[model samples]
Target: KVTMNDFDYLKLLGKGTFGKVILVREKATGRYYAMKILRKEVIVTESRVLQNTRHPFLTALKYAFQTHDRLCFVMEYANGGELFFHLSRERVFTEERARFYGAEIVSALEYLHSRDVVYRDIKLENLMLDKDGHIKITDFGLTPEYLAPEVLEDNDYGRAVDWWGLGVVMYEMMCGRLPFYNQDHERLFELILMEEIRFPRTLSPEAKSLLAGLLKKDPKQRLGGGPSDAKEVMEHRFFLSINWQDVVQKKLLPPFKPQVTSEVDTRYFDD
Candidate 1:
């Protein structure tokens, strides 16, 4: 119904495999939004996944359209920077803070599973913090270098692979790095498959156990495995104090409130 002329371009947000994301404001309503412009040929497969996107911990897709050459998805703008920004600066999160974010991500994953979808890319750069400091999982459909061991083994993995990615996220948030770390790509794959993954000495037992279960080599033995899927992760002891109901409802107080001064603020971001 509308076109790119309907909005005033503000700033470049980020670049992806398909295209670039930018900040824009609607001319008619003066509302801020994130506009993802994709190469038409490159995004034919991705567009179908964008239809009817919805979730509290996931960025909302407000509008989607296409030009002769390009496709576009207008979504809610998250002024707070990517989770990578904060983690790089703070190094690591306290167990309590990590739990809060980890819980929100679990809710996002659960919502996707209910719809029979698998989130392939669950990395720090893919997660954006909202103005409220809550995590919003973006880039819904993609792949990963930091993913299930099966993915590295170039094997067919089921939805359980996502839980392994979650374990990677949880591990990095608490310990400031991935459980399996290496500089060489070949070595990385070997480490992921054969190396024993462990938690930092200072991490709590609950967190250690949780990460261990998630990063298991056997997909069936991983958290969120079995018919219940995400439920196993929802009930993990590491999240004993997390209220799943509150997380999806956005009732729980966030651990970090990013200083987002305006609707178009890129202060915290490396723009």
Candidate 2:
């Protein structure tokens, strides 16, 4: 029941291929929100997924409306900014920090899979942080360098692609580098499809084991790709220290708390 007029456009949060995300404050409630403005079509899938989603790690869709050729999604504003921003500066996180982030992401992906949503995209950019430093996934852009081998094969894929992305993200978080990369897209795809991942000696044994399971070339054998879905990943030894319920309920404190000036702070965001 909300409209564009109900909110005051405050600042630009980001601009992407689809459209832009603007920071806004509701005039009546005085609450902050991220208003995503997308140029129509395929908005249905994103909206439907957001509407059906009700997880702590996923951004909540406050309201959705249309304005001429654009579709608007009023969503929870995570003032802590993008995970990519933080990771870029940190270069690499300690294993404990990586485990914490990986656990939260697993919780989020689990919930989405439970709803039968594939969540075809998962990367550091799509992951945001709330004022409390918890991960809040946003911009479910229908589709990622984080692509799975099957995704490049032009075969009909399922939720396994998300797990592969999780592997890449987790690897990057701890190792401070991509598992596969090339200047050319062709070479990158080829590496993703055929090249074996070269693990750094710094990675813990448990971490290496989990990444191998998640980054399996065959979707059928990938961790979290089975009937157990996320539970398979949840049970992995890498998450032994994590309390699954605590992760979902957000009872566990985040390893790193982002600094913000206020509820509407944009300091963490790039101008």
Candidate 3:
């Protein structure tokens, strides 16, 4: 129902394998929103999977309207920016910053798992920063269905995948590189399947243990133990000083500040 005529397009914000996002201003209310456009085939194929998700840290969809042959999902536009850009430009985050970002993400994972939704994709590139620099998870293209009780016993691809990605993100934040590094994509996946993460000497033991716990190859041991689990990871020694409630309210100061001047910074769109 919503069409290009509904809003004024500002600029292209981002693109993905199946769709593209544009910054637009709603004509009636004059509010800015990120409009994501996807081909009908992609939506028909992935609609059931995408509909299962519900999480606070995740970007919520505002509306799903159809064009001639495409589906447009209007979503909340996090004014900050991508977490990957922030990390790449800063060359890695300090331990305190990592802990803050990681904890927020963990809470988001908990919310998803509770709904029997397994967010198979969790990476720095998929995360968005809010105006306050807090983390907001995005990109559901890789989400998979929740596993049955029997299927959860094995470590295939499900909620545990998010934990694996959490480890990857945490390590990258601390060391400025992926735990599995190789020129070849196959080699990297092979390493992920078999190799144990080797922490750099500079990382603290507390940080290492947290990453190790999440990256465990066995799903049974993964964080939260399939939604019945509380935030045991938040209680880890590395996050001992974190005030969980304060973080949710954005009362705590973010360790890193995005180089943004106003809500409409065009630099976020730069390559």
lDDT of 2 by residue, 67-186 (tens): 888988898878886777788889998888888889889988988888888877688778888888899888743113657889889764699999998988888888887875434555
Better of 2 and 3 by lDDT: 2
Candidate 1 residue lDDT tens string, 1-271: 8799999997787777779898789899887788888887774334566457588987788888889999888888777777877887899999988889888999988988888888777777778788879998887321236768888777756888888888898889999977655445666767888889877799889899889988898888888877888888878788788778999999999888989776566575463
Candidates sorted by lDDT, best first: 2, 1, 3
lDDT of candidate 1 at residue 175, scale 0 to 100: 94
Clashing residue pairs in candidate 3 (N, C-alpha, C atoms within 3 angstroms): none
* Candidate 1 ranges with C-alpha deviation above 4 Å: 43-45, 140-144, 155-157, 182-185, 261-266, 269-271
lDDT of 3 at 71: 77
lDDT of 3 by residue, 193-219 (tens): 566778888888999888777767666
After superposition, which runs of candidate 3 have C-alpha atoms over 4 Å from their true positions?
Answer: 14-17, 44-56, 140-155, 182-184, 226-230, 259-262
Best by lDDT: 2
Estimate TM-scores for all models.
0.91, 0.91, 0.83
